[PDB]
Every structure is written in C-alpha cells, then in structure tokens.
Structure 1
Amino acid sequence: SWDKDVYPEPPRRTPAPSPQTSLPNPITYLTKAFDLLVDRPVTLVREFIERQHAKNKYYYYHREFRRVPDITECHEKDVLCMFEAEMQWKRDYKVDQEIVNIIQERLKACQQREGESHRQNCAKELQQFTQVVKAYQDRYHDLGAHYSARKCLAKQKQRMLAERKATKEAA
C-alpha cells in the first residue's frame, strides 16, 4: 500500500445497480466467472507466497541524511565543506524533482478520475501544481548542465537583488 495523504483520493461513490430491462447483462456473469476462475486461484497463490514471506521476515530502511552546512556557510574554495554542501544540494535537488513528479501524478490522476467535469473539479490540484512549478522554476531553472549549489546561490542572489530593487522602486 501507500500513504493516503500524500497521494489523496476522494471517496468512491458508486451507484447501486438499478436494472430496468429483463435481459440479463453479460457483465454480472463475467464478473462471477472472473471471481470463480481467476480471482480465487490468484488469491490462493498469493496467500501461499505471503505465508512463505511470513516464514522469514526481515527489513530494509529509509536512509536518513543529516543536514550538513549548506553552500552559504562554506568558505570560498574550501572543498571539504563545499563538497558536503554540494552533495546535500544535489540530494535536495533530486527530492524536489520527485516532489514535482508527485504533484504531476496528483494532477493527472485528478483529471482522469473526474473525467469530463475535470476543469471545475481539479482547481485545487492545478493550483498546487502551479505553485510547485513556480517554486521549482525559481529554484532550479536555467542553471545548465553543470549545475551546482554555487550556480543556484548565484541565481538566488540575482533574483533577490531583483526583488529588493522592485521593492525599492515601488515605495
């Protein structure tokens, strides 16, 4: 399974079958045949495999990286600190990439699960997607193929100079 809060789904509301005609639809018979012929043998095989998993239980872990000093508190041309800052920045870069991927999955799943009323009923996912793409674009865009924490800090300083100049000229 997964976590229902990071991958949200609204509650499924299926309608009850209200057959009007007297003709028996083939789909109920095919659902019964799929449950009797397919779902039960696959379920038995999976329960056997699950018992064989339960006979020897072992674990893997999620690797925790502690927060080393970033590039702003590294001395210039001091490789033993700015190496660690650069590795921290590259890991956070991959994590921010996957956050953008998660929100894209949310947007596409909303569009499919809402179907035809998706333009009204997916305004929240579109707003979250616009926010996270604007943040990712202000954070990591236009750095180049030799991207680094120095390049990203220089882009941030240029953008903050633009923000401070726009604050000064409009006051």
Structure 2
Amino acid sequence: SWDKDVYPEPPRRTPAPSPQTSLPNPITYLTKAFDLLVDRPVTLVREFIERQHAKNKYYYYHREFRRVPDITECHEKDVLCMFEAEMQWKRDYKVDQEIVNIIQERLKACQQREGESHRQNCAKELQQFTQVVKAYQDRYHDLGAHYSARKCLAKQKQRMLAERKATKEAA
C-alpha cells in the first residue's frame, strides 16, 4: 500500500447514466460477461496464492541511518571525517532527487485527472513544483559531474556572499 497523504487523490465523482431510449446497452451485457469470465477466476487464484503466502511469514525492514555531523565541522585534510560527511551528503542528494520525482509525478497526475481544463485545481501543485524546483536549481544545479560535496558548499558561500553584496547595495 501507500500513504494517501504523499500520493494524494481527490475524491471520486461518478454519475448515474439515465438511458433515454431502449436499444439497450451492449457494453452492459459485455461487462457482466467480463465479470463472470475474468473477475471470479482471477480472484479465486489470488485468494489461493494469498493463503499460500500467509502460511508462513517473511518480513523485510527499512534500512535507516544516523546523522554523522557535518562537512562544516571537518578540518583541512582529515579523510576519516570528510568520508562520512560526503557520503551523508550524497545520500541526501539521492533522496532529494526522488523528492523531485515525487513532485513531478504529482504534476503528471494532476494533468491527467483534471482533464481538458488544466488550470483548475492544478495551480497549487504547479506552485509547489516551481517552488521545490527553484530550490533545486538554486542548490544543486551548476556544479557539473565531479561533485563531491565541496563544490556545493563553495556554491553556497559564493551565492550567499553575492546576495550579501546585493542587500548591502539594497541597504
């Protein structure tokens, strides 16, 4: 399963079709035949397989980590500090890429659910998409292929120093 609050779904809206005239309705007979020829046997097969699964019990756990301190607390060379620092940063980088993947899947799903009126009830998700992706464009973008962690902190210092000069001019 999945949380309904990270992959959100609006509530369902489904009409009840009122037939004006009486031919009637080939697809209703065909979907009842579909139910009787497909829906029952696959349900019986899945129920058998689920009983065979629930005879025994496996479990897999989620791997979790700790917070090794910083790269801002590591010294000149000290390779057994920078190692834990940059692996912690690289795992943050992977999980942040997947944050961007989740938001972009939400944008795709808002496109396909809301139909031929795109701009109704997709303003909020496009807003948060441009927000998180503006953060990504600011934070990880223009460093290249040989990122380790140190070019990211150099970009951090250079950007906040440039904005410090900008707000000094704005003072």
TM over 0.5: yes
Q: Using the alignment, how far apart are the partners of 1:156 and 1:10 within structure 2?
A: 39
Deviations 1:103-155 (A, max 9, x none): 00000000000011112320011011101101111111011111121011011
Q: Using the alignment, how far apart are the partners of 2:162 and 2:20 within structure 1?
A: 67
Deviations 1:66-115 (A, max 9, x none): 11112111112111011001000110000000000000000000000001
Q: Using the alignment, how far apart are the partners of 2:118 and 2:25 within structure 1?
A: 30
Q: Using the alignment, how far apart are the partners of 1:50 and 1:163 within structure 2?
A: 59
Q: Does 1:59 align with 2:59?
A: yes
CA apart distance, 1:57: 1.0
Asked if the contact 1:100–1:132 (Cα under 8 Å) also holds between the matched residues in 2, the reply is yes
* Number of residue pairs aligned between Structure 1 and Structure 2: 171
CA apart distance, 1:21: 1.9
Q: Using the alignment, how far apart are the partners of 2:128 and 2:29 within structure 1?
A: 43
Q: Using the alignment, how far apart are the partners of 2:20 and 2:73 within structure 1?
A: 73
Q: Using the alignment, how far apart are the partners of 2:76 and 2:86 within structure 1?
A: 13
Asked if the contact 1:68–1:88 (Cα under 8 Å) also holds between the matched residues in 2, the reply is yes
Q: Using the alignment, how far apart are the partners of 1:67 and 1:169 within structure 2?
A: 38
Q: Using the alignment, how far apart are the partners of 1:100 and 1:142 within structure 2?
A: 17
Instruction: Report the counterpart of residue 122 of structure 2 in structure 1.
Output: 122
Asked if the contact 2:86–2:149 (Cα under 8 Å) also holds between the matched residues in 1, the reply is yes
CA apart distance, 1:63: 0.8
Which structure ranks higher in relative contact order (CA pairs < 8 Å, sequence separation ≥ 6)?
A: 1
Please give the TM-score of this superposition, normalised by the length of structure 2.
Answer: 0.96
Identity over aligned pairs, percent? 100
Q: Using the alignment, how far apart are the partners of 1:73 and 1:87 within structure 2?
A: 15
> Runs of 5+ in structure 1 lacking a partner?
none
Please give the TM-score of this superposition, normalised by the length of structure 1.
Answer: 0.96
Q: Give the ranges of 4+ consecutive aligned residues of structure 1 lying more than 2 Å apart after TM superposition.
A: none
Asked if the contact 2:114–2:120 (Cα under 8 Å) also holds between the matched residues in 1, the reply is no
CA apart distance, 1:33: 1.3
Asked if the contact 1:69–1:81 (Cα under 8 Å) also holds between the matched residues in 2, the reply is no
